[PDB]
């Protein structure tokens with residue numbers, strides 16, 4: 001048998017699927033896993049034949065968060081002010097979009113990976129929630145769904161089911177159990193068929209405007225050409 | 226019809242895009258007329274609230290693609306009016322969009338520039354310029370995330386998908402949904418309600434709610450407090 | 456006009472002016488500011504609940520007190536007109552709304568981290584009708600809380616929002632049966648007080664601090680939690 005890969009990459013034309021695959025650890029992200037995720041997305045960003053990525057977990061779950069059991073071992077999550085975030089790709093500003101395909105649980109650092117993605121496609125039976133946040137949760141959640149609901153989720157740490165996630169704008173799509181990956185890959189293929197430069201420029205302006213005045217944001221938008 | 230018509234009823238001014246063959250697409254002259262209409266509104270102390278709407282059962286299909294490369298083409302410059310006309314203006318008084326049929330691409334951007342959106346039950350909104358490969362350069366990428374949050378904004382912006390009135394209302398994009406053919410009337414009723422309120426105070430509150438975007442809590446609170454001077 | 460009740464690590468701050476329907480005048484605002492100063496500084500208090508007695512929350516600033524010694528204090532420095540509305544507390548506050556939370560009263564509810572609302576409660580910018588400006592953070596906080604579109608609706612029109620609509624738009628975080636807002640908020644406060652405190656508080660402060668900041672600067676600040 002071959003050695004275990006905690007992150008598998010599959011490509012189908014211009015769509016790259018990045019898969020967390022740690023059955024025993026319920027897709028928890030340790031140091032080597034985070035490094036592999038960061039490398040997978042670095043490779044995606046630089047590859048001009050890849051248009052859209054999908055981030056998913058195997059084994060019927062997305063990601064249980066940072067690998068607690070690895071704390072104090074050589075496999076521990078790397079926590080530094082510089083370089084990659086503890087979960088891996090969570091500080092990256094990619095030039096192209098990523099869709100999260102969520103089955104089972106997307107919790108703690110796992111939720112943060114989902115917030116980092118552009119869109120979230122969620123199974124009807126999936127659960128999201130906070131359950132410190134140092135992979136962008138406190139930054140992204142209020143921007144994504146508004147301060148009021150963000151502060152609810154952040155303070156309480158409560159579970160959010162798919163119906164509520166959809167109602168509040170956290171889940172962009174809700175699909176039947178087991179279908180998140182397929183549905184996200186199709187949506188990624190649909191996006192890959194659109195005029196790319198224009199879509200990518202519009203995405204980057206919608207990201208860049210956060211924290212800017214109307215005047216400055218409009219200026220940056222106009223550079224789309 | 227001239228491409229933009231202006232009708233007034235006391236302190237409510239209705240600005241009407243009226244280009245039947247072009248489905249109310251906005252070309253260069255049309256954009257210039259919209260900019261002038263709103264300049265005149267902003268400066269007129271007898272006008273309190275404006276309504277932006279489209280004739281012919283639709284709102285605005287976006288920038289006039291067919292006019293590209295002609296004398297009537299949209300004017301695209303870093304300075305001055307935006308391509309769609311009024312899309313860069315910071316008016317001192319509010320504007321209500323009254324949407325029938327389509328408000329798509331640059332037409333959606335005009336609707337996002339308005340303070341409020343009143344939408345017919347059958348109306349359709351969306352970033353249809355996604356499919357044509359024309360960029361959002363009249364504020365859509367700036368205003369949509371602020372209006373309805375980053376998550377839903379990025380959905381609409383990336384996919385370019387159609388949003389019907391029920392979904393627009395559910396996500397906060399449509400502020401009111403009314404029966405087909407009633408958007409203009411309902412917007413004009415709402416505009417008249419707003420015109421009856423104490424004006425200075427409402428206008429100061431509106432300007433602070435706009436200005437706070439991109440500011441820290443402290444700086445935004447400071448700006449807000451200056452409303453006491455108004 | 457302000458009563459403070461404590462139950463372990465949960466402090467309840469109560470506006471209590473029956474004749475004035477819990478309107479906040481100068482002395483009341485000063486008492487609210489002091490209550491929250493004391494809460495912030497008290498290491499044995501984890502979570503606060505802000506609520507009103509007499510079946511209502513707060514009708515706003517006390518208009519009838521204008522021009523009297525009891526008038527709201529309106530200054531660019533120091534406490535806001537409503538009292539605690541400019542404070543950046545180190546710990547969370549839950550609003551427990553019965554009856555009306557309108558005008559400055561709505562602004563106090565927006566200043567809180569969460570809002571628990573009775574099924575028959577009413578919220579709105581009723582100062583629109585009176586011509587009194589929002590100067591206790593409403594224009595700042597409402598668009599952040601629920602998005603610009605719905606904020607501008609409520610701000611321009613001054614219309615009433617019932618509990619169901621408040622819940623649908625993300626203004627009310629919980630809706631409970633009439634008469635239960637205070638109890639439900641105190642339960643929720645106790646739940647929060649049982650969680651690991653340093654972590655919850657740091658996450659809260661980062662989610663507040665990021666407003667107005669670029670992604671990069673906000674991420675930098677967040678990382679200082681660890």
Ligand code: NA
Nearest residue numbers: 211439667668
């Ligand atoms: Na800023």
